[PDB]
Design an enzyme around this catalytic site. Structure first.
Site, mmCIF file in Angstrom:
data_model
loop_
_atom_site.group_PDB
_atom_site.id
_atom_site.type_symbol
_atom_site.label_atom_id
_atom_site.label_comp_id
_atom_site.label_asym_id
_atom_site.label_seq_id
_atom_site.Cartn_x
_atom_site.Cartn_y
_atom_site.Cartn_z
ATOM 1 N N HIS A 78 21.003 -21.275 -9.938
ATOM 2 C CA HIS A 78 21.339 -22.127 -9.968
ATOM 3 C C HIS A 78 22.321 -22.726 -9.182
ATOM 4 O O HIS A 78 23.720 -23.177 -9.869
ATOM 5 C CB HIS A 78 22.565 -22.113 -11.518
ATOM 6 C CG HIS A 78 21.701 -21.699 -12.726
ATOM 7 N ND1 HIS A 78 21.299 -20.469 -13.079
ATOM 8 C CD2 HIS A 78 20.709 -22.687 -13.604
ATOM 9 C CE1 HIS A 78 20.901 -20.229 -14.262
ATOM 10 N NE2 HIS A 78 20.038 -21.818 -14.081
ATOM 11 N N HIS A 82 17.856 -25.472 -7.224
ATOM 12 C CA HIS A 82 17.350 -25.539 -8.649
ATOM 13 C C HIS A 82 17.454 -27.049 -9.286
ATOM 14 O O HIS A 82 16.060 -27.221 -9.924
ATOM 15 C CB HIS A 82 18.338 -25.240 -9.394
ATOM 16 C CG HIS A 82 17.658 -24.931 -10.707
ATOM 17 N ND1 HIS A 82 16.351 -24.899 -11.388
ATOM 18 C CD2 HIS A 82 18.178 -24.937 -11.735
ATOM 19 C CE1 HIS A 82 16.796 -24.963 -12.431
ATOM 20 N NE2 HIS A 82 17.905 -25.819 -12.715
ATOM 21 N N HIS A 118 21.711 -31.817 -14.576
ATOM 22 C CA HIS A 118 21.801 -30.826 -15.948
ATOM 23 C C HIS A 118 22.319 -29.401 -15.429
ATOM 24 O O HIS A 118 23.017 -28.960 -16.531
ATOM 25 C CB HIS A 118 20.591 -30.345 -16.479
ATOM 26 C CG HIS A 118 19.049 -29.196 -15.725
ATOM 27 N ND1 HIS A 118 19.001 -29.550 -14.433
ATOM 28 C CD2 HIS A 118 19.483 -28.376 -15.906
ATOM 29 C CE1 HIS A 118 18.166 -28.619 -13.714
ATOM 30 N NE2 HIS A 118 18.730 -27.886 -15.118
ATOM 31 N N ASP A 119 23.057 -29.403 -14.352
ATOM 32 C CA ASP A 119 23.278 -27.764 -14.089
ATOM 33 C C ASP A 119 24.628 -27.838 -13.572
ATOM 34 O O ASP A 119 25.117 -26.430 -12.627
ATOM 35 C CB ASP A 119 22.359 -27.052 -13.225
ATOM 36 C CG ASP A 119 22.293 -26.157 -14.677
ATOM 37 O OD1 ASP A 119 20.519 -25.379 -14.328
ATOM 38 O OD2 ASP A 119 22.735 -25.716 -15.283
ATOM 39 N N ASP A 221 13.351 -27.313 -16.383
ATOM 40 C CA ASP A 221 13.864 -26.777 -16.136
ATOM 41 C C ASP A 221 13.578 -25.229 -15.534
ATOM 42 O O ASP A 221 13.537 -24.374 -14.043
ATOM 43 C CB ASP A 221 14.427 -26.638 -17.601
ATOM 44 C CG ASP A 221 16.536 -25.789 -16.976
ATOM 45 O OD1 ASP A 221 16.381 -25.604 -15.671
ATOM 46 O OD2 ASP A 221 17.152 -25.568 -17.778
ATOM 47 N N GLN A 253 8.859 -9.934 -16.111
ATOM 48 C CA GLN A 253 8.197 -11.935 -16.111
ATOM 49 C C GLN A 253 7.538 -11.517 -16.872
ATOM 50 O O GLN A 253 7.552 -12.969 -17.191
ATOM 51 C CB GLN A 253 7.807 -11.761 -14.759
ATOM 52 C CG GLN A 253 8.873 -11.536 -13.167
ATOM 53 C CD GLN A 253 9.868 -12.787 -13.269
ATOM 54 O OE1 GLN A 253 10.809 -12.910 -13.102
ATOM 55 N NE2 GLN A 253 9.050 -14.376 -13.403
HETATM 56 C C1 LIG Z 1 17.073 -8.902 -12.987
HETATM 57 O O1 LIG Z 1 15.268 -9.898 -12.246
HETATM 58 C C2 LIG Z 1 15.090 -9.984 -13.403
HETATM 59 C C3 LIG Z 1 14.047 -11.809 -12.983
HETATM 60 C C4 LIG Z 1 13.919 -12.572 -13.722
HETATM 61 C C5 LIG Z 1 14.053 -12.359 -15.763
HETATM 62 C C6 LIG Z 1 13.125 -13.385 -16.229
HETATM 63 N N1 LIG Z 1 12.433 -14.474 -16.083
HETATM 64 C C7 LIG Z 1 12.979 -15.487 -15.719
HETATM 65 N N2 LIG Z 1 12.273 -16.089 -14.835
HETATM 66 C C8 LIG Z 1 13.127 -17.119 -15.217
HETATM 67 N N3 LIG Z 1 12.618 -18.221 -13.944
HETATM 68 C C9 LIG Z 1 10.973 -17.745 -13.931
HETATM 69 C C10 LIG Z 1 11.476 -17.767 -12.152
HETATM 70 O O2 LIG Z 1 10.837 -16.657 -11.303
HETATM 71 C C11 LIG Z 1 13.306 -19.643 -13.275
HETATM 72 C C12 LIG Z 1 13.069 -20.572 -13.811
HETATM 73 O O3 LIG Z 1 11.504 -20.699 -14.585
HETATM 74 N N4 LIG Z 1 14.386 -17.955 -15.146
HETATM 75 C C13 LIG Z 1 14.817 -17.129 -16.241
HETATM 76 C C14 LIG Z 1 14.318 -16.025 -16.677
HETATM 77 N N5 LIG Z 1 15.185 -14.984 -17.776
HETATM 78 C C15 LIG Z 1 15.729 -15.906 -18.142
HETATM 79 O O4 LIG Z 1 16.780 -16.045 -19.489
HETATM 80 N N6 LIG Z 1 15.302 -17.426 -17.591
HETATM 81 C C16 LIG Z 1 16.107 -18.272 -17.505
HETATM 82 C C17 LIG Z 1 17.375 -18.485 -15.859
HETATM 83 C C18 LIG Z 1 15.643 -19.522 -18.192
HETATM 84 C C19 LIG Z 1 14.916 -11.166 -15.751
HETATM 85 C C20 LIG Z 1 14.984 -10.148 -14.555
HETATM 86 MG MG LIG Z 2 21.868 -24.780 -17.199
HETATM 87 ZN ZN LIG Z 3 18.755 -25.219 -14.965
#
Ligand SMILES: COc1ccc(CNc2nc(N(CCO)CCO)nc3c2[nH]c(=O)n3C(C)C)cc1
Ligand SMILES: [Mg+2]
Ligand SMILES: [Zn+2]
Length: 295
Positions: A78, A82, A118-119, A221, A253
């Site tokens: 963040h 980003h 936004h962040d 986002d 994921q």
């Molecule tokens: C500790 O390791 C992990 C890694 C990922 C996860 C679950 N994947 C997520 N992946 C993304 N993004 C995809 C790229 O990878 C980035 C934005 O598109 N954002 C996420 C999660 N979850 C979330 O709340 N957010 C928010 C910040 C939106 C869980 C554990």
């Molecule tokens: Mg945000």
């Molecule tokens: Zn954001």
């Protein structure tokens, strides 16, 4: 003035085609901080925002440097990159996605400002200093930083607007930033999906338009989930660093893609067929994450 401002204000801004900011697969890994600032100027320019609102070059340049400076570099995900990527996806969805024709100039100006802001001042998903000092506390802080910068001397890129325009734009910016709260997106996406699956979605209704702007902000986002597999792998590593440091990752994921992203980009494709590269890239990444999960 600082050395960064005079170097950015005196630079020539390459075209949008040279900068590749019109492509949904755009990546920033090879760009320097100054290079992202120049991409941001070109986004304002090619959206005709510098012309239609009489922005002075030195004011826009100082505003971009203020926004970038108020992101924290120590935060793994963040951060300014980003925010820069969220704005780039907004630009691409407006240009290559042909969403620009469905919105007014004031809406476009607000979306671009909101995407970049936004962040602001994010501290990481695991730091509670902001919350310690209905549950959209972070997004209210982000808009507060955005408004602070927009009112700072030398940064007032909305000075060319009248009060009616200024208050309308400020209201859209606030709603757009608040819309980046995933709890608000989950609470409101049901109505958006129900309208789309009945061919009842109409952008002329002011209530549906504001809902579309909220969904569009979430799509940008999260747009990292749509990037080419080498890029998406790298960003997922940044997210994992923020979630943890500051083996079930592939399955997490896929769950994130299924529960959040897939339906959103599907609905966005129904509104504009040219936004399909986002939905396609999201599907391809679900393939690669699922194959790693089965291992
Ligand atoms: C500790 O390791 C992990 C890694 C990922 C996860 C679950 N994947 C997520 N992946 C993304 N993004 C995809 C790229 O990878 C980035 C934005 O598109 N954002 C996420 C999660 N979850 C979330 O709340 N957010 C928010 C910040 C939106 C869980 C554990
Ligand atoms: Mg945000
Ligand atoms: Zn954001």
């Amino acid at each position: 003035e600082t050395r960064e401002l005079q170097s950015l204000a005196a630079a020539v801004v390459p075209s949008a085609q040279t900068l590749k900011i019109t492509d949904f697969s755009f990546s920033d890994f090879e760009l320097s901080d100054l290079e992202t600032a120049l991409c941001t100027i070109r986004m304002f320019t090619d959206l005709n925002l510098v012309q239609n609102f009489q922005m002075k070059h030195e004011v826009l340049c100082r505003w971009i440097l203020s926004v970038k400076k108020n992101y924290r570099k120590n935060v793994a995900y963040h951060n300014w990159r980003h925010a820069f990527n969220t704005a780039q996806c907004m630009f691409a969805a407006l240009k290559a996605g042909k969403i620009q024709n469905k919105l007014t100039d004031l809406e476009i100006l607000a979306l671009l400002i909101a995407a970049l802001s936004h962040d602001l001042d994010h501290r990481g998903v695991n730091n509670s200093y902001i919350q310690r000092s209905c549950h959209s506390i972070m997004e209210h802080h982000h808009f507060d930083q955005c408004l602070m910068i927009l009112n700072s001397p030398g940064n007032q890129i909305l000075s060319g607007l009248s009060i009616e325009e200024y208050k309308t734009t400020l209201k859209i910016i606030k709603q757009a930033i608040l819309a980046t709260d995933l709890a608000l997106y989950i609470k409101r996406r049901g109505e958006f999906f129900e309208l789309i699956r009945k061919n009842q979605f109409n952008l002329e209704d002011p209530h549906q338009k504001e809902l579309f702007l909220a969904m569009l902000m979430t799509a940008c986002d999260l747009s990292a989930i749509t990037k080419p597999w080498p890029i998406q792998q790298r960003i997922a590593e940044l997210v994992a660093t923020e979630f943890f440091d500051q083996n079930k990752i592939p399955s997490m994921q896929v769950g994130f893609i299924d529960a959040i992203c897939l339906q959103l980009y599907e609905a966005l494709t129904h509104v504009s067929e040219d936004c399909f590269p986002l939905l396609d890239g999201c599907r391809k990444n679900r393939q690669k994450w699922q194959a790693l999960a089965e291992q």
